Amino acid sequence: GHMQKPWWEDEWEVPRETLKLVERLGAGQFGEVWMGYYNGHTKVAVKSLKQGSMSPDAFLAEANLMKQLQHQRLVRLYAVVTQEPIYIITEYMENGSLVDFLKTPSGIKLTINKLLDMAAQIAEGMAFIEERNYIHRDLRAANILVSDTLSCKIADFGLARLIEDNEYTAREGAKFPIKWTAPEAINYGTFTIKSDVWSFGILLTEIVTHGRIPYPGMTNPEVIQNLERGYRMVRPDNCPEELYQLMRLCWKERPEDRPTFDYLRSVLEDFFTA
Numbered sequence: 001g002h003m004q005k006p007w008w009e010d011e012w013e014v015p016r017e018t019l020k021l022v023e024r025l026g027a028g029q030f031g032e033v034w035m036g037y038y039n040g041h042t043k044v045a046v047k048s049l050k051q052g053s054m055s056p057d058a059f060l061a062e063a064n065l066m067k068q069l070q071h072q073r074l075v076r077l078y079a080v081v082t083q084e085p086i087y088i089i090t091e092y093m094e095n096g097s098l099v100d101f102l103k104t105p106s107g108i109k110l111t112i113n114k115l116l117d118m119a120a121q122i123a124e125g126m127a128f129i130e131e132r133n134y135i136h137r138d139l140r141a142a143n144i145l146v147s148d149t150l151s152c153k154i155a156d157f158g159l160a161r162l163i164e165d166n167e168y169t170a171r172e173g174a175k176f177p178i179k180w181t182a183p184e185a186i187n188y189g190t191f192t193i194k195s196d197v198w199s200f201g202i203l204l205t206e207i208v209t210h211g212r213i214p215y216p217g218m219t220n221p222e223v224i225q226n227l228e229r230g231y232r233m234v235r236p237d238n239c240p241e242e243l244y245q246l247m248r249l250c251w252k253e254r255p256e257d258r259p260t261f262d263y264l265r266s267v268l269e270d271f272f273t274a
């Protein structure tokens with residue numbers, strides 16, 4: 001079929017009557033996530049924006065990773081509904097978030113080879129985001145989605161940014177998850193692909209521990225103080241030393257000394273094929 005839209009609606013608009021919401025999967029501050037059906041036969045995930053939590057323009061900006069980047073390693077945007085309640089429709093990921101999947105009976109049983117494969121799959125998606133001049137800014141296991149075939153995809157919830165001059169600076173009152181955030185981003189609000197690399201090293205600890213919180217037994221101030229002295233996270237239990245040394249490259253003090261996502265992908269592939 002290669003041989004064969006109103007301006008006031010989004011270019012990605014679908015009529016709401018093409019969707020049937022079936023099961024509530026979760027609820028947050030910005031809204032609820034549902035499993036639904038598009039035109040009866042296609043399973044979809046629908047995010048309904050909570051009326052008042054944030055502006056329509058920010059939730060539906062064309063800036064904007066999902067509208068701009070498509071890749072097998074990235075959760076695919078399907079459509080939007082721009083009349084209230086605002087819907088964001090995406091491909092359905094049967095096994096949900098990686099952090100939840102790792103705690104299920106099948107996730108607990110994952111061999112180290114499968115955990116490294118999944119880590120290589122995230123680095124592959126991040127190598128695409130890097131090459132496209134984007135930063136993710138919230139790279140943690142909670143934002144990785146898992147398919148029915150146990151493949152991983154990166155999801156964006158509005159923090160990803162197109163970088164023009166290699167860096168984005170966050171606002172004065174911005175609050176980020178401290179345990180995943182690189183020192184230069186905590187201190188100066190400066191986010192680059194290199195602060196995503198730092199975050200990936202933290203995400204690797206969530207993968208190897210089957211969803212445990214990074215820096216066990218430590219508060220956010222104790223984490224910042226430790227980092228300032230040159231300490232890094234204590235070797236997690238059941239963490240292969242080779243993986244720990246790859247995590248440490250991600251945690252180099254100078255952002256420019258941290259590896260690229262392509263390098264990380266290449267090493268992780270070698271780790272699970274060896």
Ligand SMILES: COc1ccc2c(C(=O)Nc3ccc(NC(=O)c4nn(C)c5ccccc45)cc3C)cnn2c1
Binds near residue numbers: 059060075089093
């Ligand atoms: C089985 O359990 C589960 C649980 C969850 C899911 C999802 C899922 O979560 N998909 C998904 C991913 C990202 C978004 N994006 C946003 O919510 C969004 N918010 N802002 C502010 C944005 C700004 C710009 C762009 C996007 C956004 C929406 C959905 C719907 C897919 N399968 N699946 C299965």
Ligand code: NI
Binds near residue numbers: 001002003
């Ligand atoms: Ni054709």
